[PDB]
Amino acid sequence: KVKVLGDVIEV
Amino acid sequence: KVKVLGDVIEV
Amino acid sequence: KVKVLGDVIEV
Amino acid sequence: KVKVLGDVIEV
Amino acid sequence: KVKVLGDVIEV
Amino acid sequence: KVKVLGDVIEV
C-alpha cells in the first residue's frame, strides 16, 4: 500500500 | 511529535 | 484528479 | 476538525 | 522526484 | 505560514 507520510514546515 | 499520515484519493 | 487527504497524528 | 489536503508535485 | 505539498484545512 | 511537505511511502 502507498501512504503519504509528511511534516509540518514553517514557510 | 506531530506528523502527517494521509492517503491518495481519486477526486 | 488525485489529491492527498490526511491527518495530523501524535507520534 | 483539521485535515490535510495536498497535491503531488514534480520536484 | 514526487513530493506531497499540502495545507491544513478547517473542515 | 505552515504547509505540509511529505513523501509517498511503500507500506
Curated annotation (Swiss-Prot), chains A, B, C, D, E, F:
The modification N6-acetyllysine is found at K3. Lens as well as other tissues. Expressed in myocardial tissue. It comes from the Eukaryota. It is found in: Cytoplasm; Nucleus; Secreted; Lysosome. Belongs to the small heat shock protein (HSP20) family. May contribute to the transparency and refractive index of the lens. Has chaperone-like activity, preventing aggregation of various proteins under a wide range of stress conditions. In lens epithelial cells, stabilizes the ATP6V1A protein, preventing its degradation by the proteasome. It is linked to Myopathy, myofibrillar, 2: A form of myofibrillar myopathy, a group of chronic neuromuscular disorders characterized at ultrastructural level by disintegration of the sarcomeric Z disk and myofibrils, and replacement of the normal myofibrillar markings by small dense granules, or larger hyaline masses, or amorphous material. MFM2 is characterized by weakness of the proximal and distal limb muscles, weakness of the neck, velopharynx and trunk muscles, hypertrophic cardiomyopathy, and cataract in a subset of patients. Heteromer composed of three CRYAA and one CRYAB subunits. Aggregates with homologous proteins, including the small heat shock protein HSPB1, to form large heteromeric complexes. Inter-subunit bridging via zinc ions enhances stability, which is crucial as there is no protein turn over in the lens. Interacts with HSPBAP1 and TTN/titin. Interacts with TMEM109; in the cellular response to DNA damage. Interacts with DES; binds rapidly during early stages of DES filament assembly and a reduced binding seen in the later stages. This is Alpha-crystallin B chain. It comes from Homo sapiens. The chain holds residues 90 to 100 of 175 of the full protein.
